[model samples]
Target: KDQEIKKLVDQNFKPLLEKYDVPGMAVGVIQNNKKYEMYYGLQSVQDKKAVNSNTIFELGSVSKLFTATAGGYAKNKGKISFDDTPGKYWKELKNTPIDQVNLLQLATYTSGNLALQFPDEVQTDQQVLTFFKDWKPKNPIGEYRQYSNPSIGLFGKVVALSMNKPFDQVLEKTIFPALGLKHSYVNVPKTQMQNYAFGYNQENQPIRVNPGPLDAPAYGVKSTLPDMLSFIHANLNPQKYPTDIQRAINETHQGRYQVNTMYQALGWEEFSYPATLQTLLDSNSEQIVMKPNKVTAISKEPSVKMYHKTGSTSGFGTYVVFIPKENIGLVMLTNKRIPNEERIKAAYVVLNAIK
Candidate 1:
């Protein structure tokens, strides 16, 4: 299996980094009760340091998975519920349509008409709340899956409110420690800054996600391969973690609605292996790129269950896919914004080979 994995990476992985000019990438896999990891290219084109399993990369929206997990943890602790509307915690939102939307709707991307982001003029938390003051839904609650940072961001805030703490503090104090994630953080502290990889754009300019109202909950997580694989391990075998933590992780996988060929869960998308790469690609493309907001006909379920998520920032791109039935999973972290199709194809190739 190791030889086959090395062969696959040698044949399919090297070319991907070369073709896209990705400075570095880290891949980790869990198969047959064992763990494997491989790193490639350079941490920085200028610094010329080699990539390694411990190198950290911004997870972008992959942070959503963690945020949703925190929300679930809150639910397990009796602080929140799937059916609880945002207005239940934030009294100001009462008497408004946004209040009618529940935590599940926000986590599943079915919260009426939330925008993909806060308006340009709205930069702070107060501004975000004010925008919600006059916010109107593009459709009725739970009518469609419209991917929005604000939607989940608000959900995370409400989750924090239920715990009576800030969002970052709650995750740092509770969620990360419970999941055994040492290198995963929404805000990488000064001490760990050395491991943070610098993401570069096409022009080779270094960039990172800028701080904003929803940045912490939405797109601002930096993590390493080991930490991520542990998270996946918990996802695959939630019982190994704290009982409540396991419940929270499991809650995130509950399919709330269907988005194309994929079923939208709390922070993950569900599909099936043996699924056409194009089908997975199409479903992912529509959600992340198009960010459409409308109800559509749901597709039939697949035979073998698979869970996945894709995340990107200005100069970083990441993909994670796993088959719980098979007890196998893989995570790909890159320092450049490679094409979505390429990212998915590479992951599919490696995962298919292992299976």
Candidate 2:
């Protein structure tokens, strides 16, 4: 079975690499306690550097998973509660519509009607506060799931406020290290820049995520294969982490609402096993991406499930999927933003091929 799976990976992946013009990519698989890894292409198309396990690639929105985890961690430690509203942490939000929003709403992407990002004119923190102060919800709170960086970004800010630290400091000093994730960074320090891989845009131009209002908390994570696999392993087996961290990991997996075939958890999207790849793809489509905000009661599903996330920076793309019942997970990282169809195809094949 191992050899068959490896052969399938070799067959499906190499063709996609060439078809998509990917500069470099890393693949990791974990089945039960066994691990398999493979690397392809170049870390730097210009430098001709070989891609390896330790090479860091931008994780994009996958960083939201970490942000949500941080919130859960704070909650588990009794520093904050999921029900706490934004105004509880930031006094300026008091008496505003934003004050009515809670941490869970922000974490689940159901906070009123925040956009994917802050508007251009909103550059400073004060400006962002003012924007939300005057902003009106297109729908009532917890009524819709519109994927928004501004929403989770504010959640990170509130989490940091509760911890009495900067968001980057909170992740760097506490969360990443606690998870034994050595190569993940919200802010890459001077010494670690050497391992960072360059992202290439569609035109083959090298790029990286710019410093934006919510970049750190929204799409700022750069991580390596080993660190990410460790994260997947931890998620599958929470007993390996400290008590609070384990509880937090479990919390992030709690379903907040249902969106078609996919269920929205904190930072992760989940579906029951025996689900099709097409269904997953459909759930990610633009039409279904943002739906009407309707608050409904949630009862956790009792069955085998699959959890997954996809992230893309201007120059990089990534997909992570894991199944706890089978104790299996897979991660694919690439330097260029390839088609979602290609990503879904490759990941679907590899995941199904797993015994």
Candidate 3:
């Protein structure tokens, strides 16, 4: 039974898989209240396990969206406030510069300037603490955007500190289950470990993310298409989620800052709905991700919006996008690393096909 979107996937995704020499891809789409799942290629090159619904691919930074939701939940519950600083939740940071940056700044990637990751020398929890204590922000909070893992990682950690739990436990044990995600994890459990796909590098050798400071909240998660699809469905159709979860999700969607054509939501990036490919590509370019860019606080969001995030590990990639105004949600996961441009371009093709 060939459906329109599945047919479109073959026409589009296969060509992309070939071009990138990618090993596996699992894609999910939600449109007009309909759902579709498509799987292609293998989960492992050595074992030759086929990619299936059971496959759980690394989410990379897409995991940040869940962290954002958890942080938003803490805010909604009065457990923490976006205006609070790290000093409020963790006394160790009380007299430092990071202590002065508000939660909103960290969650929005407007924390003046936080690097993409912790310094190589900072390996232990003790060292991570020292790194932040000695670190300084280059600009005042809310002044610039340097899309960073360490920035959002700190936000999640502070939220967890306030809630009195580890970030992974807060999400895997509480938030995700409450959000109705049954197959998502910050740490893949022993029982389901077999289902985890092995990500590959240029050598086509299997590799996965190494544990690091704040990796749990920044870029550590593995999940299947159905669970991710459920997450998208809840975001687009919020009524199914618990009211508090819905509120938190809604808060994450609201715009806080603007960088060029990008509207910085808590976890997702927003563009005017029906955004041109050029705008999305431009907004996600290396300059925006790597180099610091000035950001202006925005008092309002675009009348129509498209929300999205791109995630990648050393050997995996994920691109998630949803246009609420159009009731469209698309997720693409790959075990082999591909450039953000190719993934975004490939998804745009499928999205346009369904249109």
Candidate 4:
């Protein structure tokens, strides 16, 4: 199985690099509680450095996981309820339009909030927060789910306020040390700056994506395959820790609310694979399995139950999936943002090969 996995990875690595023009990538899979990691290509063309399993990848929006973990932490400490109003912590938002929303809605991106990304113009925390405060929702609260940056960003600020500190400080004090996630951070210190990967533009050129001030909750986390493996470990084997930590992990996956019949967890989207059973039932029914190519988001019923998250940006692409029944987590990180169709097709190829 180990050699089979390696062969599949090696066969697909070059095509991925050529198709996406990516210089390097790190891929890992955890099957049956055993983990395997691999690195391919060069980290930097000029430096001629090869990316290894230890090479760090900036988790652009993947930072949301940390924010979710922080929320879980606060829940354990009894600082606030998932249903508590976010305005209680970010008092400045008390008069804003989103004031009526609660922490849970923000965490789940169902706050009827608009989506935001860190552009060069908005470089500071103050700028980001001010924009969020002034921004109005495009729809009534909870009427629609458009993934919102301000929702998660405000949640982080609220968490920090509850702790009487800044969001970055709160992350350093609790999230990082608790999970032993050495390579993860919203605002990485100067010493570890070199480890940060350069986010690329559509032109295949490198550009630094500023870790915005509200980065602690929304985006700007830097991490490696190994470190993320630890995160996956803590999430899976939380019983090895104190009760508080275990509670936090459980809270993150509490099946909080429904978004189109798919439950949204703290940092993940949960869905069952009943469609797989349908496919089996119709195996001889002479029907075509019209799965999406990538850009198209499909929500068909499936036979198996699994929770998943797929994240991508200008510089990187990532996919994280977990099957509770199987107790396995699979993660794939690449230096280039491959098209959604290519990403899923590649994933299915490996999934079928391995499973």
**Top lDDT hit:** 3
Which number leads on TM-score?
3
- Candidate 2: tens digits of C-alpha lDDT, residues 93-196: 87788888889998888876876778888878788788878867677788877788899999999999999999998999999988999889988878877678
lDDT of 1 by residue, 1-355 (tens): 5678767766666788879888898888887657778798877777887888668898988999989999989999999988898888888888887888888888777776876888888897688778877877777778877788988898998998999999888888999999998888878888877778889888978887788887888987889999889988988878778999988998888776675667777888887666788877886665554576565545675667788888999989898888888888888899998887887888788888877
lDDT of 2 at 143: 85
Candidate 3 per-residue lDDT, tens place, 250-339, comes to 988988878868888888889897889988888778889888888876755689888889999988999899888778889999999888
Tens-digit lDDT track of model 4 for 162-241: 87878887778777788877776666778876666665556767765554556657766668888877777777667776
| Candidate 3 weakest lDDT stretch, 10 residues | 1-10
Comparing 1 and 3 by TM-score, which wins?
Answer: 3
Against the true structure, candidate 3 reaches a TM-score of 0.97
Stretches of candidate 1 exceeding 4 Å from the true structure:
287-293, 296-303
Q: In candidate 1, where is summed lDDT lowest over 10 consecutive residues?
A: 288-297
Per-candidate RMSD, Å: 1.8, 1.5, 1.4, 5.9
What are the runs in model 3 whose C-alpha is more than 4 Å off? none
Clashes, model 3: 0
Candidate 2, superposed: residue stretches over 4 Å from native: 290-296, 299-302
Screening candidate 2 with a backbone cut-off below 3 angstroms (N, C-alpha, C), the clashing residue pairs are: 143-293, 143-294, 144-293
Clashing residue pairs in candidate 1 (N, C-alpha, C atoms within 3 angstroms)? none
* TM-scores, one per candidate: 0.95, 0.96, 0.97, 0.84
